[model samples]
Target: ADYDLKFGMNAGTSSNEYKAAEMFAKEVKEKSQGKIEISLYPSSQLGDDRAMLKQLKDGSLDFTFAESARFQLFYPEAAVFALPYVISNYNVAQKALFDTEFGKDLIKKMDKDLGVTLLSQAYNGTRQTTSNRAINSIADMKGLKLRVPNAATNLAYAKYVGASPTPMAFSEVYLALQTNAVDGQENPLAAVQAQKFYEVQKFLAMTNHILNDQLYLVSNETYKELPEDLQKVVKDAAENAAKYHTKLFVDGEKDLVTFFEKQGVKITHPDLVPFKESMKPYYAEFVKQTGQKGESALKQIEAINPHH
Candidate 1:
């Protein structure tokens, strides 16, 4: 067994995203009975998420974390996860979606296409914005700039809501907002607090535009080459890591209001009806292009009423 496994995360280890990576590493190593060693490369140490994903494709990196919705680039079918308000409420919908038949196949294809195995999916909660300007309603976003990941679906959603979307790296968001490169950006409550955007920003608008999930992917080539017992050990480790990460998200979401406003961030939870209705046409168009099941995911989501 190659005792060393290098894991990459765009955010630092303290972040929920990398926390999942850290926990997974510990679990994998312990379950392997010290036969497998795991090394963590936090804050894009190995490169950005996209680069790390490519490295995994070539079997150069052993492990990494990335947004599952970003898979839209590899396969548009993957964009199903990015539908507006589709998985917006993580607490109510994660298990049925991520642990179900549909999501399993999505993970299978990601591994087959990218040479990484999805160990577990970790939630990032609902994405909101901390802006220099208050964004309490849909009209507020008109002509304002917002930062989003470099993904087609992301751009589409931002545009649907009247934002001029800027594609930038996660590390650059804070400075981008400070310099007016973007007026506002969307992120989870934990992210807004952890990055301390509140210091420079004036508002915390709970858009819940996109619920996020991180894919804990291990290099398929390397994992496959390991012994059978070690493989099972690694899987057990991943499951445990996911459990802890899930708890962190759940707890953080519960305490977000107190956690954020303690830093001078004025948080706003507006009536999302207008914004959600505006998205109806956009959703219909997107789903039509995505085919029947893709559209059906939205319908099933309606029953669950996963919107914020």
Candidate 2:
């Protein structure tokens, strides 16, 4: 019994992310024979993922969850994962990370350059739009006040779709929605359910704008200290836990519309063609910023079948 590790995340205790992390910790502890113990920190007790990622870099933290988009801060091409209308679904997202040269390279670079090891990748969800007002088409998006995460790609999604983007922290969104400070926001069905956005918002639009995949990341310093067998235990546990995580999202996506409908929320499936078509300029901008490397990565991802 040697190592006591810390795993922090921005999600609250009730979330699927936290539940899956708990599953991971249980498996790790049992398989490691009590030699390695992990403590969980949910609800941003350790600050946001951005700050927790810094802690991982400096060896102040042991583990956390992050999306590929977060790595864009370190590697610009990582933004490809978050681009509007680019990633069609979770299957495509999975392949883009494990099958593409760009993805494998980023995984290696994250370990060597960023001082973080990605233990597993889990499907968070495909972000859908929810609002106080109904949106049936691209025309409905004009001048709508949309709350977006303070990320460049998300901002691009709002702008290119003709919504006036309001960048806000995730913690502020529920109140912002209630007060009408913003008309609506975009996130996964699981998130809309977890955050109880259905309570405040009346419309849930299947905009399917972005896909998110969460990484179970360990600080390299902590990972390097583990015995080889323990590393395998952790990695295997992470993969198993991620499968469970994906199940939660998959099941939630299947049944959440009914739940929302019971809660008096109207579900709308807007024609995604116009929404998809509107992103050409943003894709052009992405290529212009990231150049050939970005284009190569985009092509590899684009080539992925939308289904498994």
Candidate 3:
């Protein structure tokens, strides 16, 4: 196999994100019959997702499967998918929402607007809230400085909950916790475990906040240069990559719950009613900025997979 292509991802090799990338690489290698290869660098060995994305765009990096929300921040069109409570569960979340009209439009626009392509997407799983204290209710989050990605949905999380959303890089979060620079952070249990956030965060709330997804991306230049057959191979590999990752996430959820318990991270299955209500203003603000297109997109998303 020709190990000519390099793929960069945000999480370390011990992470599901890394697993997803590996899955894609595996498929590409298998299907290409040794004609191509994908070398994955996890742990930000290349750099942070944002920085790596910059490198990918310039053709220094061949591929990256990144969180969709990151692209949304740069292009409001993409941010539409990150609306709170708009999507629910895995099957419905992945198919109805992602493969629907609204999603296609946004993905199309991302290519034009951001100069990067969303090749395929997969259900990353429900994001949970982890804190040094309880976040079982909206009030519990008040005045808490929660570390969040530098994106609209994340910032919205802080504003709606009366918490201060501090935009920080994920790699800095553990140290930030030690220095009391952040009160808490929110993510999937897989990520929490991979980053060892439990060492700092003692409580875990099952907020079921959002169904996150990762977008397999390649630069316009990179995609265009690939042979037609190889382009199709990449796309197919991305689809397989997302499906494999979703399976891994689903299978691990229960085990992750057990792992949290063992780590002394108290888990709470909070009634999400108050949390949802609290985020109404954030949704309204998002719609206001993005307008009817946003509403139409939400409706389309709902049609595909209705959220509670």
Q: Against the true structure, whose TM-score is highest?
A: 2
Residues 73-180, candidate 1: write the lDDT tens digits.
Answer: 776656767777766566545653565666667667877777788877677777887788888788888988888877777787788888889998878888887888
How far residue 71's Cα lies from its native spot in candidate 3, in Å, is 2.9
User: If the candidates were sorted by their lDDT against the true structure, best first, what order would they fall in?
Assistant: 2, 3, 1
For each candidate, what TM-score against the reference? 0.91, 0.97, 0.90
Which pairs clash (backbone N, Cα, C closer than 3 Å) in model 2?
none
* Superposed model 3: Cα runs more than 4 Å off: 1-3, 96-98, 306-308
What lDDT is obtained when candidate 2 is compared to the true structure? Answer: 0.91
Tell me the tens digit of each residue's lDDT in model 2 across 4-38. Answer: 89999988777899899999999989998888889
Off-target runs (Cα >4 Å) in candidate 2 are none
Ranking by TM-score: 2, 1, 3
**Local error of candidate 3 at 38, Å?**
1.8
Candidate 3 residue-wise lDDT, 1-308, digit = tens: 55488888778878887888888888888888887888888767787888887887787888887766676656574565666676676665566435777666666776786567778777676888888887776778889888887667878876787888999877788899878878888888889988888888899998887778777888877778778898899899898887888788888887899998998989888788888898888778877898887777667766763443
- lDDT of each candidate versus the true structure: 0.77, 0.91, 0.78
Candidate 2 versus the native: TM-score? Answer: 0.97
